[PDB]
Design a protein around this ligand. Sequence first.
Ligand SMILES: O=C(N[C@@H](Cc1ccccc1)C(=O)NCCc1cc(Cl)ccc1-n1cnnn1)c1ccc2[nH]c(=O)cc(O)c2c1
Length: 238
Amino acid sequence: IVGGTASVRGEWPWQVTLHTTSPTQRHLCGGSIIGNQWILTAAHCFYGVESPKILRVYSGILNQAEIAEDTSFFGVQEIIIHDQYKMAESGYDIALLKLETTVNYADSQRPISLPSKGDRNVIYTDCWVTGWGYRKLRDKIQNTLQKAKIPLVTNEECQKRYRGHKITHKMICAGYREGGKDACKGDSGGPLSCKHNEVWHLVGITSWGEGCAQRERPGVYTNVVEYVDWILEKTQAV
Ligand SMILES: O=C(N[C@@H](Cc1ccccc1)C(=O)NCCc1cc(Cl)ccc1-n1cnnn1)c1ccc2[nH]c(=O)cc(O)c2c1
């Protein structure tokens, strides 16, 4: 996160850090708890990932320093990537992780509500992006979970800023004209969380952008409301 501040412990209790153990253990991506056995994250996070056996999901984390060899985690049973996904910039950048065991909810870890199809008209004015990502394009993974408040941008406004791309209705954008606050490397897969009528909704998944926090270059997020049917289909048993 560029231009953000440290989070308070447990203030983003749906936020997880997804690690890979290969070749040695490290943070891979953000993600969001959406059900007892389910993390929602970005499809591009699994480039080259051959098996779910190398993944570990940590919930209820503020600082990466909390994670040691003796720290408990959730194993991943299955990675489900959208069958139309090819790469982040062309959309469908969405994946589900089915956990091996069930998350026991608490003040430190609980699910975020998916947006309702009826809230596509809502004008969200209290949206936050969070993660352990870089503070600048060339940087490193941060210890403490960062947060930054960022306004949504219209898809017409966003399309003018990315004339070499197709900004689709299945994407949503956020950022300041002057730049300064944005997701960056290591944040992808995490939430764009918007507070509306005292309830948080998972509006976007951190997906892509040209550089980090640049002038007239909004972050681009998977527009989660466009995938509630897919999520429902994919989270069904057998
Ligand atoms: O590049 C990373 N993440 C990419 C995504 C990724 C994931 C897995 C493999 C390859 C790439 C990312 O977050 N990408 C973020 C994409 C992005 C989104 C938005 Cl909304 C706005 C701006 C950006 N940009 C960041 N940089 N340019 N644009 C990444 C992920 C985990 C890491 N762990 C480490 O220990 C050290 C790292 O350097 C590191 C880097």
